Amino acid sequence: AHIVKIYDTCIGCTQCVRACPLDVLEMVPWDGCKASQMASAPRTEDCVGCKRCETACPTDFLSVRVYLGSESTRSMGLSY
Amino acid sequence: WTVPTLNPDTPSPIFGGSTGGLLRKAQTEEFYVITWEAKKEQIFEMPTGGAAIMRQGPNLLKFGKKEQCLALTTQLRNKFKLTPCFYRVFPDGKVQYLHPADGVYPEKVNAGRVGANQNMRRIGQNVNPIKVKFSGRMMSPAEI
Amino acid sequence: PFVPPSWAPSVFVPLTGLVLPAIAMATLFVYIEKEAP
Amino acid sequence: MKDFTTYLSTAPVIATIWFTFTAGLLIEINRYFPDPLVFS
Amino acid sequence: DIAGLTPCSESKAYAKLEKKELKTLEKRLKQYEADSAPAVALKATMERTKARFANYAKAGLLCGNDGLPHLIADPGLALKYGHAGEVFIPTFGFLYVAGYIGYVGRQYLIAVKGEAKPTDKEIIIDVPLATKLAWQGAGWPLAAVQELQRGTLLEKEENITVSPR
Amino acid sequence: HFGQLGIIFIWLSGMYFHGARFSNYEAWLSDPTHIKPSAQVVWPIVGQEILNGDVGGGFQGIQITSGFFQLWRAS
Amino acid sequence: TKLFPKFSQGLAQDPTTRRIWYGLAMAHDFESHDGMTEENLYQKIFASHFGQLSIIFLWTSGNLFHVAWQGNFEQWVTDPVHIRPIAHAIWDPHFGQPAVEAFTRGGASGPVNISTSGVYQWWYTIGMRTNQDLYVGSVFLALVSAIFLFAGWLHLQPNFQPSLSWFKDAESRLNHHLSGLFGVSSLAWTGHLVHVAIPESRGQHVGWDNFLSVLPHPQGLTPFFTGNWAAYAQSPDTASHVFGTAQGSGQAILTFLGGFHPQTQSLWLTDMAHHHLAIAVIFIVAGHMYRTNFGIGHRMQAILEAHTPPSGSLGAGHKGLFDTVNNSLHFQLGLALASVGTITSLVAQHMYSLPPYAFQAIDFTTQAALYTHHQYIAGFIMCGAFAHGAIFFIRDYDPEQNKGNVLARMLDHKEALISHLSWVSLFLGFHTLGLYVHNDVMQAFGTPEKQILIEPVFAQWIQAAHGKALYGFDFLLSSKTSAAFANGQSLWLPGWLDAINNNQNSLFLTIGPGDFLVHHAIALGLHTTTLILVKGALDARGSKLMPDKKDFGYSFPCDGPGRGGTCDISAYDAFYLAVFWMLNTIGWVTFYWHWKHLTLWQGNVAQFDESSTYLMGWLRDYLWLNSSQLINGYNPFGMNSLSVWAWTFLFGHLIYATGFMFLISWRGYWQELIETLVWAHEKTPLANLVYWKDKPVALSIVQARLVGLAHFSVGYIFTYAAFLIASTSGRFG
Amino acid sequence: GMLETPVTSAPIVATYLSNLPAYRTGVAPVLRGVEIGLAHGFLLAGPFIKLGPLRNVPETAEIAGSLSAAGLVLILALCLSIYGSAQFQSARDPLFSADGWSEFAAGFLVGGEAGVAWAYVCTQ
Ligand code: CLA
Ligand code: CLA
Ligand code: CLA
Ligand code: CLA
Ligand code: CLA
Ligand SMILES: CC1=C(/C=C/C(C)=C/C=C/C(C)=C/C=C/C=C(C)/C=C/C=C(C)/C=C/C2=C(C)CCCC2(C)C)C(C)(C)CCC1
Ligand code: SF4
Ligand code: SF4
């Protein structure tokens, strides 16, 4: 499975969650940012590694990072 | 809110079929089922190609991978204002409800969710690869 | 005594070009598809 | 007229004029001083 | 002579090359009438060819065994034996013009960075400003040295972005 | 589309003009087999006039292969 | 889950055809294996090195065996000038009768291949004379191969596994390798030359059966122990000596003649014996420098800590670099590859110009093949050196432990280094290409006198300094009144000056404007290749585009379409790009070497001197003109012995072009295509009864780059090899 | 869900496929291989005989062509053997099992070689 990490520079804009085509990410309560919410990656067994989440992140440098890992049927995106 | 239970008897949208659907993986490994309630008969686009008509009321479709179910979910939500959900169905009959995980779609912050894979530092504060060398496998400094 | 027999190429060339590769491919194929306990 | 002279100041038009002028100068020098290989 | 070369004015191959080039034109000139336009064009080419071989020999170029002029690039040899006009003098001709272009462009870039929208002055040229800078670029070698001596040519390291190391 | 047609008419006009002013078409009409069609003439500069070849008909220029001479004779 | 690969559990659980590909690709990257420890890593490398050694000696055994069994070495030594060496016999049931006849050559009974490797000249020069000599050497090297293979097994056993500290004893290993592996080996080779090779070149047989009763010199070791070492330089072989016979032979065993043997046109055997004797002494002494268990010598760490310029111009200097180098296998391998890579090029440059082997110079095909062979190997080795330098920076470099030293300061001005390499490459490219194009236009318009021909006076000046009197500079060895000319006039200058002023050999060939242009093309290639490799290494850890690149490793596909798009951003991809430029550069180098020797060998250097100043000359007179015999190896009217090279020539073009498929078309296209094939197979009766165990997938992004480069590189090499051999041997065979 | 066509779902097509030995369940796997082996072994001799390197030799052509076809049958039998070893390591039809496939492969070799021999007899 790929490795997805959220870093404390997140502003809780939710754009990574909206952009994920696999429903890997979600928003959870937080107190470290004005929005009082932080991105979370609870279901990384379904991440395909497309990095649409990274494309959507506004912070500099990124607050959501994907590290490509071992390949399974799910992570490879196979329908067979 | 409580986890819904899949009803296999649900009728499926009117559709003549295609060559883009399920393969042997569904019989042996797993497949996915998406269900939603339609306010009226309407034409939508299948993620596997072609046009289908959703029946008024309950609808049910089966797909070969999770991304296909969520791709149709995005279409139904944004273009028709519906609220679909889908499951993972194993060959032995087990059903695993998937989406939305807690009844609230992930883009909306909900109470009771526990953060996962959250590092309390910036990317620039990761250690050098030399510090995790010979840890038992290949691992990034972001994994610590 | 070091000189091989005049017929050696007729045997060794087919042996290393057809027979041994066939055994090696068959052996390797079964090994790479073998399932661990 | 202000806008038209502004259009003539865009990069492609200036490049066209400047290179037409620069090429003309180099061509005309070789017309009157043919086959120059060294400076005397 | 230098590096075993010989002057083109004294080279048999150099003289033979000119005969061949003129001979090729003469053969073509036979099929045209005296006053016809093709004949006039061919003779004009012949006059230019003869002048070319006359000028290169006069300039004192060295010729190889092939009979072709060879240039001398070492400043010492060029200045000692009167070949400075081949590479050495052309060298400083280029560097003056090249620095002229570079210096004028740099001045324009700095001038427009104080404007409200610097990027608009880079796709729509401020021709009145560009023209003024072009004429003043004739003194770039003096201006450039003064900036180098005043410490204003270069930017300080603390203001230049770099990647992590 | 009118813009495209305008450009094509300029292109066609140029071909006919260069046939009228920079060609050996009249000479070619008399001896079509022994003369090479030519409708481009280069200026003498930096030695490039070698490209004006001896195409026949008391003319020097680049030999064309577009077939305009044969089209013009047919019309 | 699948067993294979055992070293990666992540790969073993991969359910696709990816796993087999990556199982092979990651097999020798020990550091990435599951459960790897530093001590076990070193022990695994040590055993692998024994495996390489046994393979090398078995490869040498095979070459000796086949020449003895199937070659014509005994016939070749009787007339090396007019006989072609035989590599091995052909047994191919696909041949037709005409092919059997065509390849039957060189005096053999059946079809054979002609050797281009030059082993005949090498073995003949060192004293081998009969097939029995070759047979015994073959058996000996097979035994040595087996011993090394056994030693690799032995040192993997519980009581024979060296500890980690043993592998990190730099001082002890350097002492032994300098004095023992370099020095004693060189001293032993001197003994062979004095006892065997030199007597054999004078018509005397010395072998194991009698070498203890034959004096290498009439005065046996008496001059050596009394200091009268000049007794061994007296009575050298005369200028009329016939190699291999006693006619005109001398008695000296250690000389400094310093030229070529007049008959063989190669280096004197007595000069090569004195060379290795002096090298042996130098290396034996050099191996007593570093400290070991005896309380004398240098500690390498102490030397490095001391060399810090007082002004602070190098910062902390070389502080911390002993641990950095000693703890990084990639820093060591990078240094080893860079050193060996440069040495391989030196071998190429010196062997053609100062041929050491008898009758090597006249074997034109062998000369061309050897230079091209070693220059291409050097090119690949240099790319690897920079590759592992970039791997070092990611995996092994520690910024805290290198704070302020020279290595950390290289990263501090990497932008200055890269941007200046960029400027040099741009200048060379613009002006070298510009001058070639200017000369092509002048040639096209029929005015060759208007082209820009810059004499290489700086290089001709160096040639004059070495004694070449053609250019008239007349100083140093070219000036008969100079101290340098006078002082050496009794040792080696007579032989050297005779050789350097003969224009029929390769010793400092005459150069002109054509040589000027191509040398700047080579500089363009070296600088651009270095730019790509250096930029790859210095940006390996991060850039403004990818600040955290070091967290992703040496090789990874990309970072996705975001931030403008990040294709080929990894340091591995920089190496992949650099290989194309290395091939282009070596291609320019070898084209230059080959064409200049083809026209010299044909007695018409003027063709090169006049055609090499413009690029149509290279296309027309080098490639097009010299392809004629090659492409007629077979045709509608028949075939000849060049048909194999004609076939290989097209074989090379085909593989080259197949590589373009992987380089241009990228994965996503193919993955979609394979899915339709997956659907079709499951829906086809009588075929869906069979099924795969690995789910088919398209090759990965990284894998496509490697495979495409492999096809590009293999086709590049084969195409030129066929052209080089066929165009040379066909001309001079 | 799936696209049904006359080619995919027809009565004549379905009946024909069920009659083939591959789809005829209730038959011993060894017998299945022999019937499949005979059919493929017989046809395989054709192209080798008529287009081999010895096609133009008067009598050697038949021997060489059929002898080469026999060699290809042996290679094919080896492919079946290793396929069963890989595919079946850990159900209704005995053919798709470790023991069944091994018997099926053995039958293919005997049937295939016999088919090649029978083809040679027909030629001469
Ligand atoms: C080094 C490897 C190698 C060797 C030794 C051979 C050998 C042969 N090839 Mg080639 N081939 C090879 C690699 C090789 N090939 C590769 C890699 C390819 C793919 C590019 C090809 C593609 C190829 C083709 C397309 C053809 C050949 C053919 C031939 C035959 C040519 C002589 C002839 O006229 O036979 C005539 C045939 C005979 C005299 C029969 C010989 C015996 C047969 C082949 C096997 C008999 C087996 C026996 C019944 C049972 C097992 C016995 C065993 C246990 C002892 C010969 C058997 C020709 C041929 O006839 O193939 C059958 C042919 O058409 N080959
Ligand atoms: C790019 C490098 C380079 C190279 C390889 C050379 C090479 C050479 N130069 Mg040149 N030179 C260069 C750049 C170079 N030069 C530059 C940039 C300049 C301008 C500053 C000069 C200015 C110059 C002069 C004034 C003279 C030479 C001379 C020479 C030749 C003999 C002297 C010598 O040993 O030079 C080797 C070069 C170096 C070690 C580098 C520094 C060279 C300095 C600048 C000149 C040294 C002159 C020397 C003391 C003269 C001795 C007496 C002479 C009669 C031999 C030699 C072929 C001499 C010659 O033969 O003139 C006809 C000479 O008189 N050069
Ligand atoms: C008999 C009437 C007629 C004629 C001759 C044409 C001719 C043409 N039409 Mg068509 N058109 C017509 C009726 C006609 N149209 C009608 C009734 C409609 C509305 C339903 C359209 C709608 C239409 C569209 C939307 C387009 C065309 C386009 C074209 C051009 C296609 C390119 C080509 O073949 O160039 C061959 C060129 C020539 C033979 C040169 C002919 C030039 C002269 C002036 C005649 C042009 C025809 C025009 C109707 C004459 C009267 C115009 C006005 C003064 C009343 C061509 C010039 C395309 C085009 O390029 O438009 C610019 C295009 O996009 N036409
Ligand atoms: C002493 C020499 C040496 C050593 C010990 C190593 C060792 C290593 N290198 Mg290095 N390397 C070297 C030289 C060396 N290298 C050279 C010379 C180059 C430049 C070419 C490189 C370039 C390089 C790169 C770019 C990389 C390494 C990597 C590695 C590591 C893994 C190797 C691996 O798994 O390969 C597995 C090898 C294969 C699967 C086979 C590859 C076959 C190639 C493509 C050629 C195929 C030719 C073809 C079959 C010919 C067919 C001919 C036809 C007619 C039949 C390992 C630590 C990798 C790493 O991750 O390091 C940390 C890595 O990415 N090396
Ligand atoms: C023949 C093919 C070719 C050419 C000409 C180039 C040229 C270049 N490469 Mg590239 N490269 C190639 C193939 C080629 N590459 C291949 C196959 C690969 C493998 C993928 C690479 C990989 C590669 C890398 C990784 C790098 C380069 C770099 C470079 C530059 C080297 C320095 C130089 O020459 O500056 C002088 C420039 C040139 C010679 C380029 C041509 C300039 C022309 C002649 C200008 C003509 C202008 C004229 C007015 C016409 C304009 C017409 C138009 C308006 C219609 C240069 C831009 C390096 C770089 O960027 O260094 C700074 C670099 O890092 N190349
Ligand atoms: C990135 C990196 C890396 C890599 C690197 C490389 C790859 C390099 C290379 C380099 C090189 C490749 C170099 C070379 C050099 C050379 C030189 C420096 C030379 C010199 C010479 C001389 C000095 C000579 C002299 C002489 C002469 C000329 C003549 C007479 C004699 C005499 C001897 C005097 C490493 C691993 C470190 C790690 C870190 C990073
Ligand atoms: S890489 Fe793609 S699938 Fe994975 S979390 Fe990011 S957007 Fe979702
Ligand atoms: S897009 Fe970036 S900033 Fe926004 S919620 Fe996701 S990780 Fe946080």
Domains of chain B by residue range: 1-143
| Rounded distance between C-alpha atoms, residue G715 and residue G648, angstroms | 10
Residue of B78, B118, B122, B140 for testing the chain A interface, max A β-carbons within 10 Å: B118
Contact H14, B33 (CB under 8 A): no
**Alpha carbon of G403 to those of A75, B123, G315, G320, G412: distances in Å?**
41, 22, 9, 8, 11
> What is the SS3 assignment for G148?
helix
Report which protein residue has its CA nearest ligand 8's atom 8: A10
Inter-chain Cβ pairs, chain A and chain G, closer than 8 A: 43
Phi then psi for residue G408, to 5 deg, are -65, -30
- Residue found under tokens 């560009």: E130
| Rounded distance between C-alpha atoms, residue G546 and residue G569, angstroms | 8
Output the CA torsion G696→G699→G703→G707 (10° steps): 100
Are H17 and G685 an interchain contact pair (Cβ–Cβ within 8 Å)? yes
| Rounded distance between C-alpha atoms, residue G533 and residue G575, angstroms | 6
Are F58 and E41 an interchain contact pair (Cβ–Cβ within 8 Å)? no
Contact B58, B10 (CB under 8 A): yes
CA of E76 to the centre of ligand 2 (A): 6
Beta pairing class for B95-99 and G638-639:
unpaired
| Rounded distance between C-alpha atoms, residue H62 and residue H57, angstroms | 9
Which tokens in the block code for residue E143? 């201006």
Which residue range is the domain that position G112 belongs to? 2-732
| Rounded distance between C-alpha atoms, residue B61 and residue H47, angstroms | 51
Judged on CB neighbours under 10 Å (0-12, 13-18, 19+), E13 is middle
Task: Give G384's contacts (C-beta < 8 A, 6+ positions apart).
Answer: G337, G341
G530 touches ligand 5 (CB under 6 Å): no
Helix (H) or strand (E) holding E7: strand E6-7
Contact G297, G289 (CB under 8 A): yes
Ranges of beta strands (E only) in chain B are 31-38, 42-45, 51-54, 57-63, 85-89, 95-99, 118-119
CB atoms inside a 10 Å sphere around CB G456: 21
Among G13, G561, G675, the residue with its CB nearest the CB of A70 is G13
C33 touches H at CB < 8 Å: yes
Contact G316, G403 (CB under 8 A): yes
Which tokens in the block code for residue A2? 């790929």
Q: Least CA distance to G552: which residue of chain A?
A: A67
* Amino acid letter, residue G698: A
The 8-class DSSP code of residue G628 comes to: H
**Alpha carbon of B64 to those of A12, A25, E28: distances in Å?**
33, 21, 79
> What is the SS3 assignment for D9?
coil
Which tokens in the block code for residue G215? 């004096």
Comparing CA positions, the residue from E87, E102, E110 lying closest to residue E141 is: E102
Query: In whole angstroms, how large is the CA radius of gyration of chain E?
Result: 26
DSSP E50-81: HHHHHHHHHTT-EE-TTS-EEB---HHHHHHT
Task: Give G207's contacts (C-beta < 8 A, 6+ positions apart).
Answer: G196
Are E55 and D9 an interchain contact pair (Cβ–Cβ within 8 Å)? no
CA of F2 to the centre of ligand 3 (A): 9
| Rounded distance between C-alpha atoms, residue G714 and residue G707, angstroms | 10
**Alpha carbon of G116 to those of D16, E28, G104, G356, H41: distances in Å?**
58, 51, 17, 16, 47
Judged on CB neighbours under 10 Å (0-12, 13-18, 19+), G457 is buried
* Atom of ligand 4 lying closest to residue G381 CA: 17
Those chains having 3 or more beta-carbon pairs within 8 angstroms of chain E are D, F, G
Contact G317, G406 (CB under 8 A): yes
Those chains having 3 or more beta-carbon pairs within 8 angstroms of chain A are B, G
Contact B77, B36 (CB under 8 A): no
Chain G residues with beta carbon closer than 8 angstroms to that of A9: none
G672 touches B at CB < 8 Å: no
CB atoms inside a 10 Å sphere around CB G442: 21
| Rounded distance between C-alpha atoms, residue G90 and residue G172, angstroms | 49
| Rounded distance between C-alpha atoms, residue B45 and residue G373, angstroms | 61
Among G414, G472, G543, the residue with its CB nearest the CB of E4 is G472
CA of G206 to the centre of ligand 7 (A): 76
H78 touches ligand 1 (CB under 6 Å): no
Output the CA torsion G393→G398→G401→G405 (10° steps): 30
Query: In whole angstroms, how large is the CA radius of gyration of chain C?
Result: 16
Q: Least CA distance to F49: which residue of chain G?
A: G445
* Amino acid letter, residue F53: G
Q: After which residues is chain B broken (C to N over 2.5 A)?
A: none
C14 touches ligand 1 (CB under 6 Å): yes
Q: After which residues is chain H broken (C to N over 2.5 A)?
A: 90
> What domains does chain A contain, in order, with CATH numbers?
1-80 (3.30.70.20)
CA of G337 to the centre of ligand 6 (A): 12
Shortest distance, CA G604 to any CA of chain E (angstroms): 13
| Rounded distance between C-alpha atoms, residue B48 and residue B19, angstroms | 8
D37 touches G at CB < 8 Å: yes
Report which protein residue has its CA nearest ligand 4's atom 59: G29
Which tokens in the block code for residue G404? 């302020």
| Rounded distance between C-alpha atoms, residue C9 and residue C25, angstroms | 23
E52 touches F at CB < 8 Å: no
Which tokens in the block code for residue G321? 């670099």
Contact G83, G107 (CB under 8 A): yes
**Alpha carbon of G672 to those of A48, A69, B48, G174: distances in Å?**
16, 22, 13, 56
Task: Give E83's contacts (C-beta < 8 A, 6+ positions apart).
Answer: E2, E60, E62, E71, E72, E77
Phi then psi for residue G402, to 5 deg, are -120, 25
> What is the SS3 assignment for E100?
helix
Comparing CA positions, the residue from G86, G120, G725 lying closest to residue G369 is: G725
Contact H123, H49 (CB under 8 A): yes
Contact G708, G659 (CB under 8 A): yes
H23 is in an annotated binding site: no
| Rounded distance between C-alpha atoms, residue B95 and residue B89, angstroms | 5
Chain C residues with beta carbon closer than 8 angstroms to that of H75: 22
What is the total residue count of chain H?
Answer: 124
Which tokens in the block code for residue F54? 């001896």
C-alpha G248: how far from chain center: 38
Comparing CA positions, the residue from H68, H82, H57 lying closest to residue H113 is: H68
The 8-class DSSP code of residue G228 comes to: -
State whether the Cα torsion G295-G299-G305-G309 is positive or negative.
positive
Which tokens in the block code for residue B131? 């510090």
CA of G338 to the centre of ligand 6 (A): 8
C-alpha G671: how far from chain center: 39
Those of residues 2-31 in C touching chain H at CB distance below 8 A are: 22, 26, 29-30
Count helices and strands in chain G by DSSP H and E runs: 30, 4
**Alpha carbon of G661 to those of G535, G577, G706: distances in Å?**
27, 16, 12
**Alpha carbon of F16 to those of A29, B109, F21, F38, G535: distances in Å?**
78, 74, 9, 12, 56
Chain G residues with beta carbon closer than 8 angstroms to that of H96: 689
G536 touches ligand 6 (CB under 6 Å): no
Report which protein residue has its CA nearest ligand 2's atom 16: E75
| Rounded distance between C-alpha atoms, residue B63 and residue B89, angstroms | 10
> What is the SS3 assignment for G2?
strand
Order across the sheet with B31-38: list the strands. B57-63, B31-38, B85-89, B95-99
Contact G277, G291 (CB under 8 A): no
Contact A39, A17 (CB under 8 A): yes
The 3 state secondary structure assigned to G575-616 is HHHHHHHHHHHHHHHHHHHHHHHHHHHCCCHHHHHHHCCCHH
* Amino acid letter, residue D34: P
Shortest distance, CA G391 to any CA of chain A (angstroms): 19
* Amino acid letter, residue G650: L
G422 touches ligand 5 (CB under 6 Å): yes
Report which protein residue has its CA nearest ligand 1's atom 50: H71
| Rounded distance between C-alpha atoms, residue G274 and residue G257, angstroms | 10
Which residue range is the domain that position E54 belongs to? 1-164
Judged on CB neighbours under 10 Å (0-12, 13-18, 19+), B67 is buried
G558 is in an annotated binding site: yes
| Rounded distance between C-alpha atoms, residue A6 and residue A37, angstroms | 12
- Domain spanning B1-143 has what CATH number? 3.30.1470.10
Cis peptide before G458 (omega within 30 of 0): no
Query: Which ligand sits nearest to residue A40's alpha carbon?
Result: 8
**Alpha carbon of G257 to those of G198, G261, G356: distances in Å?**
15, 9, 14
| Rounded distance between C-alpha atoms, residue G671 and residue G676, angstroms | 9
Judged on CB neighbours under 10 Å (0-12, 13-18, 19+), A53 is buried
C-alpha G301: how far from chain center: 32
Query: In whole angstroms, how large is the CA radius of gyration of chain D?
Result: 16
B126 touches G at CB < 8 Å: yes
Which tokens in the block code for residue H31? 């017998």
State whether the Cα torsion G142-G144-G147-G148 is positive or negative.
negative
Chain E residues with beta carbon closer than 8 angstroms to that of F54: 28, 31, 38
Beta pairing class for A3-7 and B118-119:
parallel
| Rounded distance between C-alpha atoms, residue G96 and residue G119, angstroms | 30
| Rounded distance between C-alpha atoms, residue G618 and residue G586, angstroms | 16
State whether the Cα torsion A23-A25-A29-A34 is positive or negative.
negative
| Rounded distance between C-alpha atoms, residue G464 and residue G468, angstroms | 5
Task: Give B125's contacts (C-beta < 8 A, 6+ positions apart).
Answer: none
H17 touches ligand 1 (CB under 6 Å): no
Residue of F45, F50, F52 for testing the chain G interface, max G β-carbons within 10 Å: F50
* Amino acid letter, residue F55: V
| Rounded distance between C-alpha atoms, residue E132 and residue E112, angstroms | 13
Beta pairing class for A3-7 and G112-114:
unpaired
- Residue found under tokens 């003369």: F35
G300 touches ligand 6 (CB under 6 Å): no
Q: Report the CATH number that the domain containing residue E155 is assigned in CATH.
A: 1.10.8.110
Count helices and strands in chain D by DSSP H and E runs: 2, 0
Angle at G312 between CA G310 and CA G313, to 5 degrees: 115
Contact G216, G197 (CB under 8 A): no
Inter-chain Cβ pairs, chain E and chain F, closer than 8 A: 17
Which tokens in the block code for residue B140? 């990034």
Which tokens in the block code for residue G75? 């016939």
Comparing CA positions, the residue from G516, G543, G533 lying closest to residue G612 is: G516
Query: Which ligand sits nearest to residue F1's alpha carbon?
Result: 3
G347 touches ligand 5 (CB under 6 Å): no
